[PDB]
């Protein structure tokens, strides 16, 4: 009886944390940037199996499927710009003048029709052609008219392809055979530490890649309470990925009615300009209902005292400073890249104690620098008609302040930057494990 012998068991449930290559599984109209048509057709009715009595230690900050998704999205955003036009012939002395039609004094001097010379079909003839550019794309040359595109001092851009659409489509990240994706189905999970109820899944849920700056949009809400997460909340050099439990609806619009006009800059390649603005010109904006925004700020400030003391003055401020894509709620809304000024949402002071909206004014650019690279820009072609999108503000990306002397006041000013936090607000539940079958265990038997 005591004479135990080794036995092997193949196909035994045991895993170890690992890193692999995951593949997208979006479902299978104009193609989009995330090429969610070379993805394995989504397996429906996925087999989420509840794993009982198991307690796995998660971590959303040293996770690696959020470092993999980022490089996937980058290398997948670049591959959709190779076939598209390269706007090198456009770097030329323009001659801009303010648009002459009814312009509200807020949008005064934000558009200019710059008339330049362009190469024809024939490498020897020139054509005097004009277009409409935004003030954030032209830069004056000789301050003593005569503007020039903003990026003729660094890399030249590759105009996107008008057939390709930037609309984010849900992507399911699958794990290859022999691996498993463990999700932490648990309500009050602050991001690290053990998770007393884990489950197995083959493909993560729809993670639509949106690229916002300081307000996570169209995300997935928390289950019961506004969950605040950070690496070490006591540190003031790590962002604080707040996540709401009820969405704050934000209405962003661009009220001008543009009109495209394709200009031919070479043999069989066109540059889609903006010929005319029909009507009167009016500033873009976004509306966030003041009631349901102040209420969610109250919820957040209540959950921010569980980490900072109940008698703590928590006040918000507007962004600190820097580039336009970090001090401003940048995003894209139907193919037009807005840069909104959130200094109206983040302005309040909280102490331990209708039907109006908060119109934040947005700017618009066409020369964009995604992922903050040096030698890469990208002209976004114009979009015709009034643009209007209705989003959900799901989370924030706050940053504490290094206020010393233990002052009872704490300022939280928003801040974006690396896009990784956008995914990390969705890939916090998941971790990828490597199944290690073939265990060895002793029992009372002997091979003949």
């Amino acid at each position: 009886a005591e004479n135990l012998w080794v036995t092997v068991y193949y196909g035994v449930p045991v895993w170890k944390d690992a890193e692999t290559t995951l593949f997208c599984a979006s479902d299978a109209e104009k193609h989009n940037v995330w090429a969610t048509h070379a993805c394995v057709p989504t397996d429906p009715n996925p087999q989420e199996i509840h794993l009982e009595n198991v307690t796995e230690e998660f971590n959303m900050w040293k996770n690696n499927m959020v470092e993999q998704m980022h490089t996937d999205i980058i290398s997948l955003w670049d591959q959709s710009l190779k076939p598209c036009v390269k706007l090198t012939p456009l770097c030329v002395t323009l001659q801009c003048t303010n648009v002459t039609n009814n312009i509200t004094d807020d949008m005064r001097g934000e558009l200019k029709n710059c008339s330049f010379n362009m190469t024809t079909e024939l490498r020897d003839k020139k054509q005097k052609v004009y277009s409409l550019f935004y003030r954030l794309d032209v830069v004056q040359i000789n301050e003593n008219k005569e503007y020039r595109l903003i990026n003729c001092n660094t890399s030249a851009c590759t105009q996107a392809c008008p057939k390709v659409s930037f609309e984010p489509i849900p992507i399911h990240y699958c794990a290859p055979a022999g691996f498993a994706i463990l999700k932490c189905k648990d309500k009050k999970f602050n991001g690290t530490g053990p998770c007393p109820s884990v489950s197995t899944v083959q493909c993560t849920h729809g993670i639509k890649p949106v690229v916002s700056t300081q307000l996570l949009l169209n995300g997935s809400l928390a289950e019961e309470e506004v969950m605040i997460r950070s690496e070490n909340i006591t540190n003031n050099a790590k962002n604080i990925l707040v996540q709401f439990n009820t969405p704050v609806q934000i209405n962003c619009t661009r009220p001008n009615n543009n009109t495209r006009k394709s200009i031919r800059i070479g043999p069989g390649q066109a540059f889609y300009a903006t010929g005319d603005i029909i009507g009167d010109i009016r500033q873009a904006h976004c509306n966030v209902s003041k009631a349901t925004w102040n209420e969610t700020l109250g919820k957040v400030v209540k959950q921010l005292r569980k980490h900072f003391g109940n008698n703590t003055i928590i006040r918000f401020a507007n962004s600190s400073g820097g580039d336009l894509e970090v001090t401003t709620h940048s995003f894209n809304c139907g193919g037009e890249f807005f840069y909104c000024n959130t200094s109206g949402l983040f302005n309040s002071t909280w102490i331990s104690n209708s039907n109006d909206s908060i119109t934040l004014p947005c700017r618009i650019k066409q020369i964009i620098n995604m992922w903050q690279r040096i030698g890469q820009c990208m002209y976004a072609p114009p979009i015709q008609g009034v643009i209007r999108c209705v989003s959900n503000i799901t989370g924030l990306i706050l940053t504490r302040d290094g206020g010393s002397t233990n002052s009872t006041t704490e300022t939280f000013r928003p801040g974006g930057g690396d896009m990784r936090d956008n995914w990390r607000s969705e890939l916090y539940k998941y971790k990828v494990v490597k199944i290690e079958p073939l265990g060895v265990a002793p029992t009372r038997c002997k091979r003949r």
Partner: nanobody, 124 residues
Framework: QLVQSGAEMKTSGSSVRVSCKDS????????FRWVRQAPGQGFEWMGG????????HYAPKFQARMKMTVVESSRTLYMELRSLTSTDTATYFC???????????????????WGQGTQVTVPS
């Protein structure tokens, strides 16, 4: 130039497919329009397709009856009108928005290049 199919004659209920091939390119640079002319009385907007972005824009009346397609290989626009009637007898034109040199309108201009017409007669 744009050149269309020959004049046709159909029955009340049948579907007619007009065609419009543009010899000279202009496909990924301009936006084309479908306009029909009832016998001896003005014109009537019926559609519009920008083949560069592939955006179609049907009139409200002919929103459910017709559908227009593009074929980039042969460079041809098609306009298939499904539920014909005695009142759909008209000369069907395909046009092209104004092109001032090398910069062609894509969204809203006056039609400067027309097709010869495709007289579709449906008596009943």
């Amino acid at each position: 130039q744009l050149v269309q199919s020959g004049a046709e004659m159909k029955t009340s209920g049948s579907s007619v497919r007009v065609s419009c091939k543009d010899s000279g390119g202009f496909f990924p640079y301009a936006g084309f329009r479908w306009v029909r002319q009832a016998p001896g009385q003005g014109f009537e907007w019926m559609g519009g397709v920008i083949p560069a972005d592939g955006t179609k824009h049907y009139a409200p009346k002919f929103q459910a009856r017709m559908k227009m397609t593009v074929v980039e290989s042969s460079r041809t626009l098609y306009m298939e009108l499904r539920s014909l009637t005695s009142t759909d007898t008209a000369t069907y034109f395909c046009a092209r928005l104004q092109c001032a040199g090398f910069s062609c309108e894509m969204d809203s201009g006056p039609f400067d290049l027309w097709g010869q017409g495709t007289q579709v007669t449906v008596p009943s």
